[PDB]
Amino acid sequence: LKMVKVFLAVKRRIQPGDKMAGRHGNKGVVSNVVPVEDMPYMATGESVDI
Amino acid sequence: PRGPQIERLTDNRAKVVIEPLERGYGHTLGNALRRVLLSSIPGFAITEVEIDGVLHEYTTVEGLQEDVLDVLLNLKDVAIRMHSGDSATLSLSKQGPGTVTAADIRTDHNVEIINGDHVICHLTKDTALNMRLKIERGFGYQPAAARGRLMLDASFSPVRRVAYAVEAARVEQRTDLDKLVIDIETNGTIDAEEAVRTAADILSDQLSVFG
């Protein structure tokens, strides 16, 4: 007699364990999330993300 | 011993000079101050945004070119320096065609806003934009989950990048005393003097457990 459809929008962040592949076929799984202070930095101060 | 020497290359990015340190004291002090200047300094950011016409963060409002999420990211991009207090509330009123900058908001006497060359949104029609903001104090990174009302992430970090290098200073002493320079690039919120002052305060409060 009646139908109710509910649209639910979820915005998920990135989690350790999610599968993320590159462009040339090098797939991978995120191990952990590291703070910026532990990442290796260049001579100018730019921290490497990956 | 002589005090920190301040160079002024850019009004947003300064450089401090510490000299003369002993042999084997430049690298540890530089790395400790770099890590503390990166991930310890508290700041101010926008936590929640209350708009009367916008119900949730996925709807479309008439008269606006961009979506609501672009306005939320542009409000996350700006930086607010507050003199005193742990909470504040800023409102903006802008109608008619034209761009909406960060300087068009209504601020208090203690709440200081950067001039804001980055735009927030783009208005086309003659629609009034009544938007209420909220500023809170904190340190680090706090997500929206763990804390008609919207919620926004906040990155309480006025410092962008910290670099340092150890150079030798030719001085008549018992050994080869080395100096170091630290160039701090901020968003204009915090100064390079009180940043290393509260970094040394954090180090002195953390080293107070021994003894």
Q: What was the resolution (in A) of this experimentally determined structure?
A: 3.4
B48-86 burial, b at 16+ Cβ within 10 Å, e below that, comes to bbebeebeebeeebebbeeebeebbebbeebbbbbeeee
Could you tell me if B150 and B56 are in contact, meaning their C-beta atoms sit under 8 angstroms apart?
Answer: yes
Q: Which residues of B touch A44 (CB under 8 A)?
A: 161, 163
Q: Which residues of A touch B183 (CB under 8 A)?
A: 45
CATH class of B1-42+157-211: alpha beta
Q: CA distances (Å), B183 to each of A8, B22, B155, B162, B208, in order?
A: 47, 21, 21, 6, 28
Q: Which architecture, in CATH terms, is B43-156? A: Beta Complex (2.170)
Elucidation method: cryo-EM
Could you tell me if B11 and B166 are in contact, meaning their C-beta atoms sit under 8 angstroms apart?
Answer: no
Could you tell me if B173 and B20 are in contact, meaning their C-beta atoms sit under 8 angstroms apart?
Answer: yes
Could you tell me if B43 and B159 are in contact, meaning their C-beta atoms sit under 8 angstroms apart?
Answer: no
**Containing H/E element for B178?**
strand B178-186
Q: How far apart are CA A44 and CA B163, in angstroms?
A: 6
Q: Which of B80, B91, B77, B92 is nearest to B123 (CA)?
A: B92
Token pair recorded at residue B161: 């990048």
Q: Which are the contacts of A12, defined by CB distance < 8 A and separation ≥ 6?
A: none
Q: Which amino acid is at A3?
A: M
Q: What is the location of CATH 3.30.1360.10 in chain B?
A: 1-42+157-211
Q: List the beta strands (DSSP E) in chain A.
A: none
Q: What is the location of CATH 2.170.120.12 in chain B?
A: 43-156
Token pair recorded at residue B157: 């970090």
Task: Choose among B38, B183, B185: nearest Cβ to A36.
Answer: B38
Token pair recorded at residue B180: 């170091």
Token pair recorded at residue B20: 């003369």
For B106, other C-beta atoms within 10 Å of its C-beta total: 10
Q: How far apart are CA A4 and CA B1, in angstroms?
A: 74
Q: Which of A43, A40, A18 is nearest to A31 (CA)?
A: A18
CB contact under 8 A, A44 and B163: yes
